[PDB]
Design a protein around this ligand. Structure first.
Ligand SMILES: Nc1ncnc2c1ncn2[C@@H]1O[C@H](COP(=O)(O)CP(=O)(O)OP(=O)(O)O)[C@@H](O)[C@H]1O
Ligand SMILES: O=C(O)CCCCCC(=O)O
Ligand SMILES: [Mg+2]
Length: 239
């Protein structure tokens, strides 16, 4: 019996922490304990525990590579460069970067989810452009093991999380992703696809800049299934 544990937390009506864990009955309390402890400070927290009906185990198989640069301009060019290796018009890849660096949310600032960009046109396919689409119901099959492995290999807790998220995106039919954090002090971002793997790029933004985001490069003809997979398919990723 598998359970999805989803936590969100707020201070003063602004989102401050979030996570999901998908575990067996025997590890259910451990997981709740982790997520309860997760935010340093909050005034409202919600935890949601849901029994999993169908799910699928998938084997992780992306090559990881890191790349460093003098400035964000150089970083963002390499991002575009690498995206074209997935068959994306340079104009489209450039459009994603522009969107992210300007603030993906039309109101201003950060979306809570991702832009769904049409690979051919560059058009924003998502209906709510403030909220975007959120990739949920996924986790490492054995997170203890993955976490110790990836940390002493050099990578960070963000990497651990971002790896699992993207892998699900790519599995769900997303052709490629552009992403960088919105935390103003973490300036390593990435670009990923089945061909290029997971490609870490520092620095993808200036230090102290609080804007970040995700763009999923999707084929329009597949939009529905992709949105369905992203939001609903339960996926456990195995190393
Ligand atoms: N589950 C998800 N699905 C799709 N996009 C997401 C996402 N979580 C975050 N994003 C996008 O990625 C950008 C950066 O978020 P991150 O820095 O990776 C995690 P976070 O901002 O700390 O939220 P968290 O507190 O839930 O972890 C956000 O601006 C948002 O656009
Ligand atoms: O792989 C890394 O080390 C960079 C993590 C990607 C940053 C994404 C995020 O934190 O939102
Ligand atoms: Mg953050």
């Amino acid at each position: 019996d598998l359970f999805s544990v989803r936590m969100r937390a707020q201070k003063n009506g602004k989102h401050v922490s979030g996570a999901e864990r998908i575990v067996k009955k025997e590890e259910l309390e451990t997981a709740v304990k982790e997520l309860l402890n997760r935010p340093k400070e909050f005034d409202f927290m919600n935890v949601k525990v849901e029994k999993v009906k169908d799910f699928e185990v998938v084997k992780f198989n992306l090559k990881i590579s890191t790349y460093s640069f003098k400035s964000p301009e150089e970083a963002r060019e390499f991002a575009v460069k690498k995206l074209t290796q997935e068959g994306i018009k340079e104009e489209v890849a450039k459009k994603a970067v522009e969107i992210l660096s300007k603030g993906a949310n039309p109101k201003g600032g950060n979306m809570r989810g991702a832009v769904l960009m049409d690979i051919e046109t560059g058009e924003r396919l998502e209906e709510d452009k403030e909220r975007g689409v959120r990739t949920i119901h996924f986790d490492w099959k054995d997170r203890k093991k993955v976490t110790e492995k990836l940390l002493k290999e050099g990578y960070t807790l963000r990497t651990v999380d971002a790896l699992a998220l993207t892998f699900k995106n790519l599995f769900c039919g997303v052709v490629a992703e552009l992403c960088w954090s919105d935390d103003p002090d973490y300036v390593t971002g990435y670009v990923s696809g089945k061909e290029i793997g997971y490609v870490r790029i520092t620095p993808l933004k200036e230090k102290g800049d609080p804007l970040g985001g995700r763009v999923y490069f999707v084929s329009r003809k597949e939009l529905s299934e992709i949105i369905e997979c992203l939001t609903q398919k339960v996926v456990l990723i195995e190393l």
